Amino acid sequence: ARPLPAGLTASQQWTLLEWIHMAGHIETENELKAFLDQVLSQAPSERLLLALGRLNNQNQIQRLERVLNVSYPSDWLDQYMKENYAQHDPILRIHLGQGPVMWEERFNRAKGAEEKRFIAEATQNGMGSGITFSAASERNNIGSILSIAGREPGRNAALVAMLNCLTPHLHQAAIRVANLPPASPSNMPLSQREYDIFHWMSRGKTNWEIATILDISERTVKFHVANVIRKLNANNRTHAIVLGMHLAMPP
Amino acid sequence: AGLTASQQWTLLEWIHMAGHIETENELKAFLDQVLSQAPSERLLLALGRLNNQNQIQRLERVLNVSYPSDWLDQYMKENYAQHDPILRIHLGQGPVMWEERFNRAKGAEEKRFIAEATQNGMGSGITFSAASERNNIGSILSIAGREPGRNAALVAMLNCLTPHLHQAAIRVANLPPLSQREYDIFHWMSRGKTNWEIATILDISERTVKFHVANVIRKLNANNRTHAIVLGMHLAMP
Numbered sequence: 404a405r406p407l408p409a410g411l412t413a414s415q416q417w418t419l420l421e422w423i424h425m426a427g428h429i430e431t432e433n434e435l436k437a438f439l440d441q442v443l444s445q446a447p448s449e450r451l452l453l454a455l456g457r458l459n460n461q462n463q464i465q466r467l468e469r470v471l472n473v474s475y476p477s478d479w480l481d482q483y484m485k486e487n488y489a490q491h492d493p494i495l496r497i498h499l500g501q502g503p504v505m506w507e508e509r510f511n512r513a514k515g516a517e518e519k520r521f522i523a524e525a526t527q528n529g530m531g532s533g534i535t536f537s538a539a540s541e542r543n544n545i546g547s548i549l550s551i552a553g554r555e556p557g558r559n560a561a562l563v564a565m566l567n568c569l570t571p572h573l574h575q576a577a578i579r580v581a582n583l584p585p586a587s588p589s590n591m592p593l594s595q596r597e598y599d600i601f602h603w604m605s606r607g608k609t610n611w612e613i614a615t616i617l618d619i620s621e622r623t624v625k626f627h628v629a630n631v632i633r634k635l636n637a638n639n640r641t642h643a644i645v646l647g648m649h650l651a652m653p654p
Numbered sequence: 655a656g657l658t659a660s661q662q663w664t665l666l667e668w669i670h671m672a673g674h675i676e677t678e679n680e681l682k683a684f685l686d687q688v689l690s691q692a693p694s695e696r697l698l699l700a701l702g703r704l705n706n707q708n709q710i711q712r713l714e715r716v717l718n719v720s721y722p723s724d725w726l727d728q729y730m731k732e733n734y735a736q737h738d739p740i741l742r743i744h745l746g747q748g749p750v751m752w753e754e755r756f757n758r759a760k761g762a763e764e765k766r767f768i769a770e771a772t773q774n775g776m777g778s779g780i781t782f783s784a785a786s787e788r789n790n791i792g793s794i795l796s797i798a799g800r801e802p803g804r805n806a807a808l809v810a811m812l813n814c815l816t817p818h819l820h821q822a823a824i825r826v827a828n829l830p831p832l833s834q835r836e837y838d839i840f841h842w843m844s845r846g847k848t849n850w851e852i853a854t855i856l857d858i859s860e861r862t863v864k865f866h867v868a869n870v871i872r873k874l875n876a877n878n879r880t881h882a883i884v885l886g887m888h889l890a891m892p
């Protein structure tokens with residue numbers, strides 16, 4: 404996870420609390436759009452971008468999923484697509500979840516020719532330097548990037564730390580609006596062996612009416628049942644009949 | 655506003671961690687670090703299907719681990735589920751104390767359950783609620799005891815935490831843009847084609863096409879024609 408920043412006034416702190424809180428409440432796209440609007444107006448810039456993207460193991464982006472963009476100049480867009488800078492952009496090469504990255508700092512250390520060429524072209528349309536924050540969701544190799552272009556965003560150390568802890572909640576909010584399909588565990592086994600044993604564990608039976616029933620005897624029933632109760636994260640078995648109440652219905 | 659200074663710190667911490675909960679154990683663990691800043695040791699977290707009416711129809715999953723071991727056995731056996739005046743709350747409407755909602759239940763099956771609860775320590779408590787009307791699914795979070803409710807500062811803390819536990823519960827369990835004619839419009843907008851080359855292909859006058867182009871854009875929340883193209887790229891790829 405990410406550790407909160409400090410050396411934030413309460414306003415700064417209260418504010419951030421505000422953002423995270425609301426973010427937990429975003430569903431429809433309209434919500435997400437406005438929310439960012441209020442964010443990018445306590446922000447030394449008017450050019451933002453929010454994108455989902457599938458991830459690899461080192462948490463690089465390979466393909467982009469969806470973009471819920473904000474302000475980027477629609478000329479730099481046209482050109483970004485046409486020239487297919489997507490490949491030569493040194494920013495899509497970050498490893499996600501490592502927040503946050505300065506455009507300037509990551510532009511003086513790119514040493515390819517296709518890169519140094521993109522970098523220069525960016526520096527004309529204002530994308531010379533900027534900062535981007537990232538969040539990743541390794542359960543599913545999906546990730547978020549959030550960019551703001553400009554030299555001024557990064558000179559605001561307080562606000563950088565705030566946006567950086569907000570990111571991972573924007574990520575959650577993003578996944579929610581774009582209703583991506585699973586992604587499935589898909590679902591935790593009964594499990595097979597457990598269902599026969601849990602199938603009946605819940606109502607009207609003892610370790611013995613079960614072992615005999617499964618031809619495993621009270622003993623096998625006993626060895627197998629507590630794998631269940633610890634599987635279902637339950638201290639008590641009749642507490643395991645309560646938590647694992649749902650499986651014997653959803654299959 | 656506010657109030658206290660500290661409390662915000664922990665409250666903020668609770669919401670931050672609850673936005674990170676994926677796995678089931680993560681949820682388990684976290685509810686412990688919550689119920690140990692809590693005047694009680696008997697809670698419980700449950701999802702349930704949400705009807706148009708406030709009262710729940712069926713329980714989906716229970717992901718708790720507090721309630722005793724006897725009161726459970728009995729709650730099931732007697733099927734108190736029906737006459738429990740608590741499952742009758744309407745979700746998403748602040749918190750409601752057990753005591754306050756027990757002196758105002760006036761049925762006999764109810765007054766009978768209420769009394770049986772009062773022997774097993776459930777004679778008083780509190781329950782916060784979160785609902786998700788997009789899908790009629792909702793969360794309850796209970797803590798049993800007279801002491802939880804006498805602590806105003808966290809009552810309000812746990813109350814604002816609830817809706818984030820709700821989100822965390824869903825994810826732990828689950829599992830539950832443009833008109834088609836226009837999409838053809840957009841399908842072309844995206845290949846470089848001008849307003850004209852479209853009238854061309856789908857056989858519609860520019861006024862007819864220049865009209866659709868505007869509609870798709872706002873639908874997507876885009877500034878211009880070349881930023882609606884970008885926002886919506888995920889539409890013609892899936």
Ligand SMILES: O=C(CCCOc1ccc(Cl)cc1)N[C@H]1CCOC1=O
Nearest residue numbers: 452467484489494495525530550884
């Ligand atoms: O903001 C970013 C990263 C995201 C750019 O992704 C894309 C990819 C494809 C499309 Cl169509 C649009 C944006 N990069 C800054 C750095 C300099 O110029 C930029 O565009």
Ligand SMILES: O=C(CCCOc1ccc(Cl)cc1)N[C@H]1CCOC1=O
Nearest residue numbers: 645726729730738740741771776796
């Ligand atoms: O906390 C609740 C609602 C949740 C009770 O759900 C269940 C259902 C089944 C089981 Cl196994 C356990 C708890 N109800 C309070 C009100 C008085 O006594 C209670 O138990």
